[PDB]
Structure formats: C-alpha cells, structure tokens
C-alpha cells in the first residue's frame, strides 16, 4: 500500500528514463505553398498535397 | 506565558506527540524552562578583606611608581583648560586625583576629562586605583587613607 523507505533521487530518474518525449521525426513540405506541416495533415494556410481545400 | 491551559489535543488516538500545554518550553512561543528573575549579584566582602586589598593595591602602586604625592592639587578657576595644562605639565594623561577636600573648581574642571577622575580620600575604590595609569594623592589625602586603613 505504501513505502517502507523513501525511494532515492536515482530510482526516481530511472523510472523517468522512459518519460522523454519524441520529437517530430520530420516535417513535410507542401508541393505548392512550401509550408511545413505534420505529414498527412493540412497546412496552417489550408493546403493539403498542393490543393487549397479550406476557405482560409 | 499568556495563553490557555487547554490541552492542544487529546492524549491518545492522534499520531501526534502527547502535548499538555501550548506554553511548554519545547514549543515555539512557549515558556523559558528556567526563566530568569531579578537577582542581586552583590557579594559579601569582609571588612578586613577590602582594607587588605586596598593596602595591597596602594603598596603595588608605590612599587610600580604609579602613586604620585603632592602637597596640593589646585586649579584656580573651574576650567578644563587650566587643569589639562597642569596635567600636561605634570606629564599626566590618565590619572585618578585624590584630594582630602572636595574642591568645587577641581571636580568641575575634570568632569569633561574622560581619563581624569577627582575623588575625596573617602571615595577611593579598588578598581579605580587599578584602572587608572597614575594615582595622584595630596599629602593630606595620604593621612586620611592611612587613618582609614592603618
């Protein structure tokens, strides 16, 4: 239920050894607008794979 | 300590240390365990031990040439400037002047001089005889002190 001993600074860091975040392995570039975006996502200006399928 | 006699918490059942008083000396803001009262620090000196030390001190001032003796120690008007010249002409800076009779002009003239103290023969104390570098005693003061102590 609860600990009989304070775990150390070291055990705490060992637990967190898998807590690092992975970065975006690569951004993709639009063939038409050159914007960087998440792959298979639309751009922030509304482009996906060179086509402007949003109003904005 | 001002506060109540109420038990801060109950004796048993809390995992807390047993307490009884918010004024316990263990506690911050509590009482001092052996709080001081006024007290008289004075000591008994036997009559003979005091005279015995005074005679010893004076003998040691004579051996150390710290006792100066003069017929008289007179400043005419009540001025430091006249006395400071006298002590500069007698080659004296830190000095206890012991006269037989309180001269009003001399007590006043010396009051603003920190290293000078003028006393009557009856005003001697053992510290002031040790504390000052030189002791100047009028001839008539030597008589009084000899009769006091003998």
């Amino acid at each position: 239920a609860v600990q009989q001993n304070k775990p150390t600074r070291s055990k705490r860091g060992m637990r967190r050894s898998h807590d690092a975040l992975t970065a975006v392995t690569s951004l993709s570039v639009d063939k038409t607008s050159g914007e960087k975006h998440l792959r298979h996502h639309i751009t922030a200006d509304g482009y996906y794979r060179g086509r402007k399928v949003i109003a904005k | 300590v001002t506060g109540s006699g109420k038990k801060p918490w109950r004796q048993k059942g809390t995992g807390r240390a047993r307490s009884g008083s918010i004024k316990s000396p263990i506690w911050r803001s509590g009482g001092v365990t052996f709080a001081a009262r006024p007290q008289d620090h004075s000591q008994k000196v036997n009559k003979k031990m005091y005279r015995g030390a005074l005679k010893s001190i004076l003998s040691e001032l004579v051996r150390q040439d710290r006792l100066i003796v003069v017929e008289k120690f007179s400043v005419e008007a009540p001025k430091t400037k006249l006395l400071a010249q006298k002590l500069k002409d007698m080659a004296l800076e830190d000095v206890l002047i012991i006269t037989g009779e309180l001269d009003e002009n001399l007590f006043l003239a010396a009051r603003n001089l920190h290293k000078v103290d003028v006393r009557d023969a009856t005003g001697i104390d053992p510290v002031s005889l040790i504390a000052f570098d030189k002791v100047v005693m009028t001839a008539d003061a030597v008589k009084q002190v000899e009769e006091m102590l003998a």
Binding site: - | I57, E60, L61, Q64, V127, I130, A131
Partner: protein, 48 residues
Amino acid sequence: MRLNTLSPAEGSKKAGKRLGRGIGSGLGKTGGRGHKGQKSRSGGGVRR
C-alpha cells in the same frame, strides 16, 4: 597590576558540573542519575 593581569588563586574556581552535554563530558544522557527509578525522575527522591 591592571584590570587584565589579575588572576584568582589556583584551586579557588572550580568549573561547575553541566549535566546532559554529550559523551565526552562524562555527564551526558542520564547526567549521573543512572537509569529508570524514583531517583532518576525530576523532583525524585524519598524524604529525609
């Protein structure tokens, strides 16, 4: 003979015991009272 060259006679000023001030002193912990009885207790002691 000055206010800083006056000693007491040797043997005239004994230290004074301080209880419960550590191991080295020899009066630490129980401070000379031994262990667990009436005599150990604060204000402990049978009457004359």
